[PDB]
């Protein structure tokens, strides 16, 4: 997208979102990042939304194919050939490529230029998320290292968020939500997931009195997601 103006890429990313053209949206936002300037809050959100939609579709497809593959590998199942595994592998490779692309943007050079807490925490949460999606499909000799990379990114983001943001800040809340999902689903640490979700919820509740009506709505929406997980987990 090197020949398109930064502002035009951003405008077209917004149009692609309205048109539900998320691969286009992600390509426009990748082009915008590659202009080399830091991203505003809105631009960071567009980048994140674009890739969450792309990888979300790939993850859902991978789960469908992985379930079919697992069923075909059961006792009393008829041999259907290599096609299910081959196609699951194709989708998996594509998904890994998207995660590597996002991680590459964060490493070159979004994170190193991010000095304010809101940008740095948001980017480190993204880094944790995309390593988490790599971990969901990992099975080889690097699976432990991929898990540790997700954990390390989330932990750095948590440490900053606790020092620099109020307990109701929506980035702080979403980071804690996603880190608790990492603990529950990836790290085999359901008790850590439950403790994190409960403490995050309770500390946010006690800070709601400081907020405007609109900030209250923002924070309580994410708090309800923490509560939904706690209801499923306990």
């Amino acid at each position: 997208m090197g020949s398109m103006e930064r502002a035009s890429l951003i405008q077209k990313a917004k149009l692609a979102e309205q048109a539900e053209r998320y691969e286009d949206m992600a390509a426009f936002m990748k082009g915008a990042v590659e202009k080399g300037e830091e991203l505003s809050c809105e631009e960071r959100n567009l980048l994140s939304v674009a890739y969450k939609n792309v990888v979300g579709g790939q993850r859902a497809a991978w789960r469908v194919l992985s379930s079919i593959e697992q069923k075909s590998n059961e006792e009393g199942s008829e041999e259907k050939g290599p096609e299910v595994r081959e196609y699951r592998e194709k989708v998996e490779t594509e998904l890994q490529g998207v995660c590597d692309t996002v991680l590459g943007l964060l490493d070159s050079h979004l994170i190193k230029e991010a000095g304010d807490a809101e940008s740095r925490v948001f980017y480190l949460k993204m880094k944790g998320d995309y390593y988490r999606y790599l971990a969901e499909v990992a099975t080889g000799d690097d699976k432990k290292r991929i898990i540790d990379s997700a954990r390390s990114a989330y932990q750095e983001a948590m440490d900053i968020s606790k020092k620099e943001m109020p307990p109701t800040n929506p980035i702080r809340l979403g980071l804690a939500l996603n880190f608790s999902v990492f603990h529950y689903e990836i790290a085999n640490s359901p008790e850590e997931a439950i403790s994190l979700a409960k403490t995050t919820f309770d500390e946010a509740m006690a800070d709601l009195h400081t907020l405007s009506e609109d900030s209250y709505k923002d924070s309580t929406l994410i708090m309800q997601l923490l509560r939904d997980n706690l209801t499923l987990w306990t």
């Binding site: 994140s48 939304v49 939609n53 996603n178 999902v181 689903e185």
Partner: peptide, 9 residues
């Protein structure tokens, strides 16, 4: 277990 959907600006 649900993460942030994060799919709408």
């Amino acid at each position: 277990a649900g993460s942030i959907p994060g799919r709408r600006s």
